[PDB]
């Protein structure tokens, strides 16, 4: 029963609050409707954002504790960091990241989907809005599966994520592979860390393939952002390509990034 | 200018 081992809180965002009645963890319970699920998977038919969610659970990637169906919807009970921030809201209250935290944050993020990608899964949506800051322990934790596929070499022509974090490939041709088209929406990732906001809204803005900067971000910096923001998928750099970057050496350790920058 | 989240 679901009702017996959970104490339901307030809404988050359909997702609420929760702690479980066993040992007072604090959960998150999220509720998928059965007539909104696009794509079905097995392990039992199940919503693929199971699926994939089983597959991925290492501290990077959200936990899922357990899952229920019911007649018209399914229940996910995730892991629920406390205190949390999203990275969407920490950015917005914070402004543009200093390059020492965004590199950080970077990193964290890289080493999570490499995971994702290791175990067969690709998130394809990922953005701000979608990575939970754990404030105490500077750790990063990439949520919501509800856009992701199997990881395939193959070409993908289907998309559900977010548009603006979307390359151009698949705003032009409707076609996309996943590791260069995940390569693109970090470069949007990371030009929003160190410049307070995303950089492209609009479809010709995407396809134009011109990225200004509207802060002072080093030359180092602008250079990785641009090289993932590359029109043609495969002059984008590989992920070994990026985490071996100039810029992206000397990180700080989640702790000392809890220390310095989040308490 | 204004930011802001972006349903998927
Ligand atoms: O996988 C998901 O969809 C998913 C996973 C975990 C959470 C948990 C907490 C939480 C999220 C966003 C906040 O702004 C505050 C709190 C939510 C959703």
Same mark, same amino acid.
């Given at each position: ?20 009645? =066993?040992?007072?963890? @604090? ?31 290492? =501290? ?5 504790? $357990? ?5 018209? =919807? ?6 629920? @960091? ?48 979608? +990575?939970?800051? $754990? ?22 022509? $289907? ?46 803005? +995407? ?29 984008? @750099? ?6 071996? /970057? @100039? ?15 989040? /308490? | ?8």
């Amino acid at each position: 029963p679901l009702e017996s081992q959970y104490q339901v809180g307030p809404l988050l965002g359909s997702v609420y609050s929760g702690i479980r009645v =066993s040992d007072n963890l @604090p959960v998150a319970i999220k509720h998928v409707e059965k007539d909104r699920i696009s794509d079905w998977g097995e392990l039992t038919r199940v919503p693929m954002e199971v699926v994939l969610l089983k597959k991925v659970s290492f =501290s990077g990637v959200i936990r899922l504790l $357990d899952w229920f169906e019911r007649p018209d =919807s399914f229940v996910l009970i995730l892991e629920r @960091p406390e205190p949390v921030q999203d990275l969407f809201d920490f950015i917005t209250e914070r402004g543009a990241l200093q390059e020492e935290l965004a590199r950080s944050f970077f990193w964290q993020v890289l080493e999570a989907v490499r995971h994702c990608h290791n175990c067969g899964v690709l998130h394809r949506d990922i953005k701000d809005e979608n +990575i939970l800051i $754990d404030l105490n322990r500077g750790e990063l934790k990439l949520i919501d599966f509800g856009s992701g596929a199997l990881l395939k070499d193959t070409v993908y022509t $289907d998309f559900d994520g977010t548009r603006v974090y979307s390359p151009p490939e698949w705003i032009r041709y409707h076609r996309y592979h996943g590791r260069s088209a995940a390569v693109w929406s970090l470069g949007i990732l990371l030009y929003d860390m160190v410049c307070g906001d995303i950089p492209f809204e609009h479809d010709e803005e +995407i396809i134009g393939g011109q990225v200004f900067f509207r802060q002072r971000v080093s030359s180092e910096c602008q250079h990785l952002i641009r090289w993932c923001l590359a029109l043609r998928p495969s002059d984008r @750099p590989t992920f070994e390509e990026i985490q071996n /970057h @100039p810029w992206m050496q000397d990180v700080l350790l989640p702790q000392e990034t809890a220390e310095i920058h989040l /308490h | 200018r204004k930011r802001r989240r972006h349903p998927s």
